[PDB]
């Protein structure tokens, strides 16, 4: 009971919160993750009872910051994450005269003095129905040509059978898009029609297959100009080069990267097939639209203060000039309900338009390229991503680089040699205790400190924290 | 006919979207011109045709085991992006819209409370935020920058976008033809407030932005304006997309000629193409349509005996006039409330579009963009702001690659048991000899120790060819 | 006086209307009170009206072979303020419209689902505000803690920690 | 009030402050890496060295000006509290939302006293002196007036909640791309070249402290796009050719450090006859005095 102080009145056990007080739950003293929200930091089954607790925000981890210590990963994991965004709705259209005014010329002659309200609501719903197809074309119709995969799948160990369309299945869908269509589940009444979308469900999938074939074949050059093909290890090597990792890492770990990619792609179908409400962002759109239509039909049964809600029943036993004011209450109540429906559909269409603009932005900046912006295409350093078609939406499979298996190294800002301060060209100076090396920042790869990976500026008396080591000059064994 | 079958009523064709009469069904597909629904679109060969839309030309790119396509040329191109930022600052009067000059219905209007005050406050908030949208988009410079009096930009011509001193309004030809392309109520108590920034001041803001970017690059959007030679600015804008700057210094005349041709095509495309200013014509048409139905809803009776207030106050005494007065006030009040609701929903969309236009000004005009398909199709270099009536036009100058060769590659080169990886660019080969070139242009170089780096040995990479990596140290010692 | 001529009772005619009580000056300032159509509005014991000045003019010395390389810099901290949530309010329709009266409530139930639609919409707003706050602030999987020794190389964080 | 209740937020101000404290400790002790994967520790000079390296400034500029950069940062951080204490209406974006919500609530309370054509506005008086079959329409006018005012308030809160949801999506994007990393987007995380950002808890909002790199003092120099040497044209590998009047130097674009033009600082492309407006100078090959 929120907003009461329960010294006044099931009554099992009573705890006083700041969000009211809660009856029937035991207040434990240890904190967990918030499972059922209540309010004011209190959340709510464990140990044969419903428990109530102050939430735990996360596991506390004080990372070992130090004077001259750095942490660089010696390995990585490649994780694929899903993001689900709705792009469109059902294009509903309401005939106002048939809706408030079913087959009665008496209400029609009573309705012509209300003016242009019904064609205003029809214009608003028509603009909504034009806006949904514009949203779908702005999300999916971004490639100028339809690209096709090669008949041989020689991608260097990278397996795309879960993502590319399968000709054995009808309407040319992937297993992931097929399970999305099986996990998203979708009549004709008085005055209500549902306009079909301009882009059909088998043919939005042709745009997604064209984008997938163009991405896998050509990198991002099809999004810029003509589609310039590339081997897929070379494509993933320069996508590794876009996030500060040198190209030799994939060329020395290519089978591990291919196996991690295939395992992470195969875990996606199992994760969104075994996790409930992962497609809730698509399910709530269909549920809100169908519930708004069900409320719109259900407000025809309201009397609005009249003797009955049936227009022929209140005409069949009453005179015309009291049946006039009995009809007119139903006209103003059903017209107010119809304007409420059109207003809520306009606000929901604005929300769907904002989500579709976000989906088209994510399609352009994750699918047609590689994003340097953090957490816009998944958690981790973004490599590449995969669009998948969905009922009234789009699903992105963000393939991201995630570091793992770190080790401490003792670092320094600069290294003094012969009175000169050496700074790293790409990367940092690290040490394991005895010797100093130069590594790149995102991967542990120790190298001998030379003059072609360091640069010289200034002296050693100006840099705070400079250490002393030697720098190997490559001219020395030829001079010796 | 939308929601029916083709069993109830010169040629009748059944579609999935309904029953279509008057269009011939043609098997082969075309690009969609008039949308119907469910993939069917609809004049060609003096008749109306009906077809499934074509999804673009279909080509299969020759994916190979070991080949990259690398361009030998490029076409620099200018695309237009047109975004609305504002609407007309409309404001109505409550008692003059609902009643007018009648205190004996003003007393019944005071029985409804603050229904005047809520709609006036909402329309006032819209009229304040429409100036905030224009200020947030155009007012991004601290200082008003001016062009040099001579125009020696290395070959680049900017007379289409710089303002003309012979013009009495101090506008560019592109901004003037944008002003001459769109075409545009104040009678019963509804007013149109003028904007805070006039068109000359908005053109002065865009001229300050234009002179600032051609004089400084991206430095004036960050800090103080640091001057640049403009070929060196375009070379440093090539250097941000992956092309080395030597390509511009060898092809500067071709870049200037293609840029001037692509800029001169913009005025011809905006003059010739019908409904080019669609997103700015649509907001003016929507505001005019809402204003027209706001005026036209006074002619409705709303159950009263006459729509005009003056004759029913002239022919009924108040204790039976007030039944008609209450119906007229209720109908006009909920009509005005409907208008304010649709104007708030439209003003949220205009606010989102103006936020997008200010964001596109900030990282297309004031800087260089690495997020692709956000500042035009292709590799973005820079863009030009152009003022527009209740809108802004971006002239996105992008780098689009031209014709290419298909080559043959290898990801690593083994030399004396050591695997050599390229620092920038990839290895290519035209059949016999191997070269190092950059990715976005074919500039083949001899494989040296300078442009390649070594890591590991030759048993870890799955495809390696064997060549000689030539260092200058052995001939300059021998 | 909005959108009229100055013929219907100092006097200054603007495009936005007839301005009475503000003197017109020739020179321009940065805008203080917005009037409209480039006019803005206290200085020298009176209310002034002026044309807007968009800034200070700066002809940057363009040459075909001249660079301005910065020899020095500054480190600037700016504040950006963004709202993320509002107050989770809710109304009861029966107690608001129809307080403690079943003889109004029996005719309020004749209107259908109007006032449970409003409750459902405000419930969705109140759910949406917590989703907004969690989406903005809850972006870490772990709660991180600063070390007790503030050896940050000369950088002071006590105003921020 | 009568029917109006205010639900408290799920996250209290201590928990929002602990989220911002976790974000601040994460960004101070690890840079950008805690938003990507695990929080990997780094010294804060080397963190600021990579954040200088992201905007075209080499790390040696910070490593020779670390005390000046720390003093400028501490002065600019200490100016924030003084500016927020002495400048009114800086928090107007947080003031207007609670002003609009409380003002809409006060309007919803004040519309209860409206008549809408009734003989009195309070329900109990028009109930208590009238019979029900004559009083039903007398109730029903107040019913439809209060219902129209309530659905007006719900429509206004829906449009305002859409606006606050758009602002919260912008704030979450600015958190993820200014706090959890370094952004190359111009004017997205403050005026200037963005280094790093600081979230701060606010009542119904968030305040970002964007640390930016702004250049201060510039000098004129004469350029050349290439340097001629024995028929070859040398183009800058990184930075610009500058001259003080007599001798030519290579410096980076965002800071003035002149170095001698060497063969490891430029690259050879083509000849001098194709590039317009280039000068003649000497590019010194470093191995020649080593063998000589
Ligand atoms: C890096 O080394 C430091 C110290 O050498 C480790 O920090 C210690 O972590 C344990 C874990 O609970 C604490 O009990 C110690 O007090 C910490 N010591 C110091 C000096 O902070 C740190 O765990 C190492 N990091 C990794 C990834 O191995
Ligand atoms: C890509 O992954 C799929 C999924 O494992 C592979 O399909 C399997 O193929 C083997 C035969 O090689 C069958 O025994 C399995 O039953 C298949 N699994 C499923 C789930 O159908 C597919 O072969 C892989 N592609 C390549 C080129 O190896
Ligand atoms: C690079 O070579 C490939 C194959 O050698 C070319 O692909 C063929 O191009 C011809 C052009 O007349 C077509 O008729 C063939 O059908 C293509 N074959 C395949 C399998 O696609 C490719 O076009 C060449 N690239 C360039 C730019 O010339
Ligand atoms: C790159 O493309 C340009 C055109 O985009 C080529 O320039 C043309 O060259 C022909 C050669 O006879 C001239 O007739 C044309 O007038 C040129 N056009 C322009 C706009 O200058 C150029 O030759 C191409 N270069 C390469 C190496 O293919
Ligand atoms: C920059 O472009 C403008 C526009 O194309 C050039 O103006 C043209 O000048 C010629 C004279 O040689 C006239 O015949 C054209 O009619 C002009 N065009 C227009 C639209 O008026 C201008 O000459 C160019 N600047 C330079 C230095 O070449
Ligand atoms: C770059 O700018 C800073 C700040 O303006 C200069 O630091 C000042 O230097 C003067 C004299 O050297 C001192 O009196 C001030 O106290 C310093 N201010 C601060 C905040 O440290 C710095 O000298 C400039 N660099 C150059 C090379 O001129
Ligand atoms: C970091 O900056 C803060 C600024 O407040 C310094 O704290 C102040 O120190 C002086 C010196 O004793 C005290 O008089 C003030 O009362 C302190 N202010 C506060 C708010 O505590 C702090 O000393 C600085 N840290 C270092 C290491 O210099
Ligand atoms: C670079 O050179 C230009 C021109 O030689 C300088 O611009 C002059 O600045 C002074 C400052 O008041 C003006 O009075 C002159 O009229 C300007 N000259 C021109 C031609 O506009 C500029 O100041 C120099 N830059 C620096 C940093 O000194
Ligand atoms: C059921 C239970 O253990 N309740 C404890 C209480 O006994 C203790 O006094 C308090 C303070 O620590 O915390 C809680
Ligand atoms: C503590 C440690 O790992 N030290 C090693 C050392 O044993 C080894 O000889 C050297 C490479 O030569 O690298 C370092
Ligand atoms: C910390 C340290 O040992 N620094 C040394 C210094 O003592 C010595 O005088 C100088 C000359 O070689 O080299 C460095
Ligand atoms: C509904 C539809 O698509 N096609 C129908 C078909 O099913 C039906 O058998 C035929 C006979 O009238 O009329 C048509
Ligand atoms: C592809 C290829 O020719 N690889 C050769 C291999 O055949 C040869 O045995 C080796 C030296 O023994 O050098 C390498
Ligand atoms: C709630 O009741 C307790 C019990 O007396 C009292 O101490 C407390 O002050 C009350 N709080 C409020 C807000 O009335
Ligand atoms: C990196 O992790 C993978 C886990 O799949 C493991 O197989 C591999 O050996 C690890 N590499 C190193 C160098 O530890
Ligand atoms: C480590 O801390 C000591 C003081 O305890 C200091 O003198 C030294 O300079 C620090 N080292 C580095 C690299 O900052
Ligand atoms: C169109 O195609 C279908 C099947 O492809 C065929 O049966 C029909 O005759 C074609 N129509 C015309 C006019 O060629
Ligand atoms: C190229 O094709 C051959 C045979 O078709 C195959 O053995 C080899 O693994 C392929 N890949 C390379 C060289 O990367
Ligand atoms: C106001 O009246 C004067 C008198 O004729 C006229 O010259 C002027 O144009 C009028 N101004 C407007 C804005 O109507
Ligand atoms: C403004 O300038 C005009 C033009 O000379 C002059 O007549 C007038 O007196 C000036 N007004 C003021 C207030 O300076
Ligand atoms: C220009 O630089 C050279 C090289 O250091 C120096 O000798 C000369 O004095 C400088 N001239 C001026 C005017 O600064
Ligand atoms: C710069 O302009 C001058 C005109 O005084 C000219 O002599 C010189 O050749 C031009 N330089 C370049 C590189 O265009
Ligand atoms: C540069 O050298 C070439 C050939 O030695 C000569 O023709 C040219 O005039 C020189 N440039 C200048 C500015 O003297």
Under 8 Å CB-to-CB from C46, ≥6 apart: which residues?
C23
Nearest to D147 among C78, C115, C153 (CB): C115
Structure tokens at D92: 């107007």
User: Which residue(s) pair with C50 in the sheet?
Assistant: C40
**Residue of A413, A414, A421, A477 to mutate when probing chain D, most D C-beta within 10 A:** A413
- What span, in angstroms and rounded, lies between the C-alpha atoms of B304 and B310? 13
The count of C-alpha atoms lying within 13 angstroms of the C-alpha of B427, restricted to the half-sphere facing its C-beta, is 29
| CA B409 vs CA B73, B161, B233, B293, D86: distances in Å | 20, 44, 33, 67, 65
Across the interface, whether the CB atoms of D163 and B348 are under 8 A apart is answered yes
Phi, psi of C23 (to 5 degrees): -80, 150
The three-state secondary structure class of D2 is coil
Residue B222 · residue D192 · CB < 8 Å: yes
Structure tokens at A432: 């394991």
- What span, in angstroms and rounded, lies between the C-alpha atoms of B376 and B80? 8
**Most informative mutation of C22, C25, C26 for ligand 20 (most atoms within 8 A of CB):** C26
Instruction: Give the Å distance between the CA of B246 and the centre of ligand 23.
Output: 20
DSSP secondary-structure letter at D177?
A: I
User: Which residue(s) pair with B392 in the sheet?
Assistant: B83, B387
- In which order are the strands placed within the sheet that holds A454-459? A454-459, A420-424, A415-417, A467-468
Q: Is the CB of B257 under 6 A from ligand 5?
A: no
Continuous segment of H or E residues that includes residue C91: strand C88-91
Residues of B in contact with A135 (CB under 8 A): none
- What span, in angstroms and rounded, lies between the C-alpha atoms of C153 and D102? 47
Nearest to B201 among C52, C61, C69 (CB): C52
Across the interface, whether the CB atoms of D25 and C83 are under 8 A apart is answered no
User: Which residue(s) pair with B78 in the sheet?
Assistant: B397
Nearest to D207 among C79, C86, C88 (CB): C79
Nearest to C145 among A60, A305, A340 (CB): A60
Q: Is the CB of A68 under 6 A from ligand 16?
A: yes
Instruction: Give the Å distance between the CA of A256 and the centre of ligand 1.
Output: 30
Task: Using DSSP bridges, classify how beta strands B49-52 and B24-25 pair: parallel, antiparallel or unpaired.
Answer: parallel
Instruction: Give the Å distance between the CA of A15 and the centre of ligand 9.
Output: 13
- What span, in angstroms and rounded, lies between the C-alpha atoms of B269 and B226? 34
Structure tokens at B143: 């200082």
| CA A323 vs CA A145, A311, A343, C111, D134: distances in Å | 63, 9, 30, 19, 19
Number of Cβ atoms within 10 Å of the Cβ of B399: 22
User: Which residue(s) pair with C51 in the sheet?
Assistant: C39
- What span, in angstroms and rounded, lies between the C-alpha atoms of A287 and A322? 41
- What span, in angstroms and rounded, lies between the C-alpha atoms of B230 and B215? 7
Tell me, in Å, the resolution of the deposited structure. 3.7
Under 8 Å CB-to-CB from A4, ≥6 apart: which residues?
A20, A21
User: Which residue(s) pair with A447 in the sheet?
Assistant: A438
Structure tokens at A205: 């999938």
Nearest to A206 among B36, B55, B400 (CB): B55
- What span, in angstroms and rounded, lies between the C-alpha atoms of D69 and D140? 71
Atom 5 (ligand 2) nearest CA: A266
DSSP secondary-structure letter at D178?
A: I
- Cα D249 to the chain's mean position, in Å? 36
Ligand positioned closest to the Cα atom of A446: 10
- What span, in angstroms and rounded, lies between the C-alpha atoms of D220 and C68? 5
**Residue of D147, D187, D240 to mutate when probing chain B, most B C-beta within 10 A:** D187
Would you call A301 an interface residue with chain C, using a CB distance cutoff of 8 Å?
A: yes
Long-range contacts, D280-289 (Cβ 8 Å, 24+): D280/D227, D280/D228, D281/D227, D281/D228, D281/D229, D281/D247, D281/D248, D282/D229, D283/D227, D283/D229, D283/D234, D284/D260, D286/D262, D287/A475, D287/B473, D287/B476
The three-state secondary structure class of C105 is helix
- What span, in angstroms and rounded, lies between the C-alpha atoms of A220 and A228? 9
Nearest CA distance, B296 vs chain C (angstrom): 23
- Cα A441 to the chain's mean position, in Å? 29
DSSP secondary-structure letter at C43?
A: B
Residue B383 · residue B394 · CB < 8 Å: yes
Q: Is the CB of B157 under 6 A from ligand 4?
A: no
Closest by alpha carbon to A391, among A293, A281, A291? A281
Dihedral sign computed on CA atoms, order D84, D86, D87, D90: positive
Residues of B in contact with D272 (CB under 8 A): none
Produce one character per residue of D139-168: b if its CB has 16 or more CB atoms within 10 Å, e if not: bbbbbbbbbbbbbbbbbbbbbbbbbbbbbb
Ligand positioned closest to the Cα atom of C50: 20
Closest by alpha carbon to B213, among D215, B266, B78, B205? B205
Across the interface, whether the CB atoms of B229 and C65 are under 8 A apart is answered yes
Among all chains, which residue has been given the structure tokens 């295939």?
A262
Under 8 Å CB-to-CB from A435, ≥6 apart: which residues?
none
SS (H, E, C) chain A: CCCCCCCCCCCCCEEECCCCEEECCEECCCCECCCCEEECCEECCCCCCCEEEEECCCEEECCCCCCCEEEEEEEEEEEEEEEEEECCCCEEEECHHHHHCCCCHHHHHHHCCCCCHHHHHHHHHHHHHHHHHHHHHHHHCCCCEEECCCCCCCCCCCCCCCCCCECCCCCCECHHHHHHHHHCCCCCCCCEEEECCCCCHHHHHHHHHHHHHHHHHHCCHHHHCCCCCCCHHHHHHHHHHCCCCCCHHHHHCHHHHHHHHHHHHHHHHHHHHHCCCCCHHHHHHHHHHHHHHHHHHHHHHCCCCCCCCCHHHHHHCCCHHHHHHHHHHHHHHHHHHHHHHHHHHHHHHHHHHHHHHHHHHHHHHHHCCCCCCCCCCCCCEEEEEEEEEECCEEEEEEEEEEEEEEEEEECECCEEECCEEEEECCCEEEECCCCEEEECCCCCCCECCECCCEEEEEECCCCCCCEECCCECCCHHHHC
- What span, in angstroms and rounded, lies between the C-alpha atoms of A427 and A441? 5
Number of Cβ atoms within 10 Å of the Cβ of B264: 14
Could you tell me how many residues make up chain A?
480
SS (H, E, C) chain B: CCCCCCCCCCCEEECCCCEEECCEECCCCECCCCEEECCEECCECCECEEEEECCCEEECCCCCCCCCCEECCEEEEEEEEEEECCCCEEEECHHHHHCCCCHHHHHHHHHHCCHHHHHHHHHHHHHHHHHHHHHHHHCCCCCEECCCCCCCCCCCCCCCCCCCCCCCCCCCHHHHHHHCCCCCCCCCCEEEECCCCCHHHHHHHHHHHHHHHHHHCCHHHHCCCCCCCHHHHHHHHHCCCCCCCHHHHHCHHHHHHHHHHHHHHHHHHHHHCCCCCHHHHHHHHHHHHHHHHHHHCCCCCCCCCCCCHHHHHHHCCHHHHHHHHHHHHHHHHHHHHHHHHHHHHHHHHHHHHHHHHHHHHHHHHCCCCCCCCCCCCCEEEEEEEEEECCEEEEEEEEEEECCEECCECCCEEEECCEEEEECCCEEEECCCCEEEECCCCCCCECCCCCCEEECCCCCCCCCEEECCCCCCHHHHHC
Structure tokens at C101: 């009266």
Structure tokens at B366: 């004031």
**Most informative mutation of B63, B64, B65 for ligand 18 (most atoms within 8 A of CB):** B65
Residue B364 · residue B351 · CB < 8 Å: no
Residue A164 · residue A155 · CB < 8 Å: no
Please give the method by which this entry was determined: cryo-EM
Atom 10 (ligand 23) nearest CA: D280
Would you call B148 an interface residue with chain C, using a CB distance cutoff of 8 Å?
A: yes
Could you tell me how many residues make up chain C?
161
- What span, in angstroms and rounded, lies between the C-alpha atoms of B289 and A120? 10
Could you tell me how many residues make up chain B?
478
| CA A469 vs CA A23, A414, A416: distances in Å | 69, 10, 6
Q: Determine the straight-line distance between the first and last CA of chain C, rounded to whole angstroms.
A: 53
Number of Cβ atoms within 10 Å of the Cβ of B319: 7
Closest by alpha carbon to D45, among A245, A66, A381, C143? A66
Phi, psi of A433 (to 5 degrees): 130, -35
Would you call B3 an interface residue with chain A, using a CB distance cutoff of 8 Å?
A: yes
């Amino acid at each position: 009971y929120q907003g009461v102080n329960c010294t006044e009145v099931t009554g099992s056990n009573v705890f006083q919160t700041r969000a009211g007080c809660l009856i029937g739950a035991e207040h434990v003293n240890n904190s967990y993750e918030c499972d059922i929200p209540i309010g004011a930091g209190i959340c709510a089954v464990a140990s044969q009872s419903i428990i109530a607790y102050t939430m735990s925000l996360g596991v506390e981890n004080s990372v070992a910051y130090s004077n001259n210590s750095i942490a660089i990963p010696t390995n990585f994991t490649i994780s694929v994450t899903t993001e689900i965004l709705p792009v469109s709705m059902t294009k509903t259209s309401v005939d106002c005269t048939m809706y408030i005014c079913g087959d009665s010329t008496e209400c029609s002659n009573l309705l012509l003095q209300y003016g242009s309200f019904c064609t205003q609501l029809n214009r608003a719903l028509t603009g909504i129905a034009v806006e949904q197809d514009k949203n779908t074309q702005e999300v999916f119709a971004q490639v100028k040509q339809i690209y096709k995969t090669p008949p041989i799948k020689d991608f260097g160990g990278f397996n795309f059978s879960q993502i590319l369309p399968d000709p054995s299945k009808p309407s040319k869908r992937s297993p992931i898009e097929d399970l999305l269509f099986n996990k998203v589940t979708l009549q004709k009444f008085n005055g209500l029609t549902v306009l079909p979308p301009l882009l059909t469900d088998e043919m939005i999938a042709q745009y997604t297959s064209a984008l997938l074939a163009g991405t896998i074949t050509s990198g991002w050059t099809f999004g810029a100009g003509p589609a310039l093909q590339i081997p897929f290890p070379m494509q993933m090597a320069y996508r590794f080069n876009g996030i500060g990792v040198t190209q030799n890492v994939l060329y020395e770990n290519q089978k591990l990267i291919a196996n991690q990619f295939n395992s992470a792609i195969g875990k996606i179908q199992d994760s969104l097939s075994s996790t409930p409400s992962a497609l809730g962002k698509l399910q709530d759109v269909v549920n809100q639209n169908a519930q708004a239509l069900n409320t719109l039909v259900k407000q025809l049964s309201s009397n609005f203060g009249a003797i009955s809600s049936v227009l022929n029943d209140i005409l069949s036993r009453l005179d015309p000039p009291e049946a006039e004011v009995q009809i007119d209450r139903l006209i103003t109540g059903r017209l107010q309900s119809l304007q409420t429906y059109v207003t809520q559909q306009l606000i929901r269409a604005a929300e769907i338009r904002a989500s579709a603009n976000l989906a088209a932005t994510k399609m352009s900046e994750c699918v047609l390229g590689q994003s340097k912006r953090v957490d816009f295409c998944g958690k981790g350093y973004h490599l590449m991503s995969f669009p998948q078609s969905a009922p009234h939406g789009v699903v992105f499979l963000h393939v991201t680089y995630v570091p793992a298996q770190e080790k401490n190294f003792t670092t320094a800002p600069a290294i003094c040699h012969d009175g000169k301060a050496h700074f790293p060209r790409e990367g940092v100076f690290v040490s394991n205790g005895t010797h100093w090396f130069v590594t790149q920042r995102n991967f542990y790869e120790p190298q001998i400190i030379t003059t072609d990976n360091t640069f010289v500026s200034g002296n050693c008396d100006v840099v705070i924290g400079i250490v002393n080591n030697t720098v190997y000059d490559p001219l020395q064994p030829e001079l010796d | 006919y939308q929601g029916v079958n083709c069993t109830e009523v010169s040629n009748v064709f059944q579609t999935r979207a309904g029953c279509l009469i008057g269009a011939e069904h043609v098997n082969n597909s075309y690009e969609c011109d008039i949308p119907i629904g469910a993939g069917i679109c609809a004049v060609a060969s003096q008749s109306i045709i009906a077809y499934t839309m074509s999804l673009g030309v279909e080509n299969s790119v020759a994916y190979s085991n070991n080949s990259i396509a690398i361009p030998t040329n490029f076409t620099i191109s200018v695309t237009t992006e047109i975004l609305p930022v504002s609407m007309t600052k409309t404001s109505v009067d409550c008692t003059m819209y609902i009643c007018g000059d009648s205190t004996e219905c003003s007393n019944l209007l005071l029985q409804y409370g603050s229904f005047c005050t809520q709609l006036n406050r909402a329309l006032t908030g819209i009229a304040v935020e429409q100036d905030k949208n224009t200020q947030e988009v155009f007012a991004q410079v601290k200082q008003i920058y001016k062009t040099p009096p001579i125009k020696d930009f290395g070959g680049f011509n900017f007379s289409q976008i710089l303002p003309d001193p012979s013009k009495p309004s101090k506008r560019s030809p592109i901004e003037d033809l944008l002003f001459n392309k769109v075409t545009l109520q104040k009678f019963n108590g509804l007013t149109v407030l003028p904007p805070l920034l006039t068109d000359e001041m908005i053109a002065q803001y865009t001229s300050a932005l234009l002179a600032g970017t051609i004089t400084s690059g991206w430095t004036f959007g960050a800090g103080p304006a640091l001057q640049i030679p403009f070929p060196m600015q375009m070379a440093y804008r090539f250097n941000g997309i992956g092309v080395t700057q030597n390509v511009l210094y060898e092809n500067q005349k071709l870049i200037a000629n293609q840029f001037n041709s692509a800029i001169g095509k913009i005025q011809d495309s905006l003059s010739s193409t019908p409904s080019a200013l669609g997103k700015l014509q649509d907001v003016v048409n929507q505001n005019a349509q809402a204003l027209n139905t706001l005026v036209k809803q006074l002619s409705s009776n709303f159950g009263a005996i006459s729509s005009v207030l003056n004759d029913i106050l002239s022919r009924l005494d108040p204790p039976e006039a007030e039944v008609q007065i209450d119906r007229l006030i209720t109908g006009r009040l909920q009509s005005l409330q409907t208008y304010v609701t649709q104007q708030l929903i439209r003003a949220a969309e205009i606010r989102a579009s103006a936020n997008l236009a200010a964001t596109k000004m900030s990282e297309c005009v004031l800087g260089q963009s690495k997020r692709v398909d956000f500042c035009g199709k292709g590799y973005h270099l820079m863009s030009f702001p152009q003022s527009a009536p209740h809108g802004v036009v971006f002239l996105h100058v992008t780098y689009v690659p031209a014709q290419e060769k298909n080559f043959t590659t290898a990801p690593a080169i083994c030399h004396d048991g050591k695997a050599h990886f390229p620092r920038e660019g990839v290895f290519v080969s035209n059949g016999t000899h191997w070269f190092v070139t950059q990715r976005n242009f074919y500039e083949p170089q001899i494989i040296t120790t300078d442009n390649t780096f070594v890591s590991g040995n030759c048993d870890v990479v799955i495809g390696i060819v064997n060549n000689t990596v030539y260092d200058p140290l052995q001939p300059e010692l021998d």
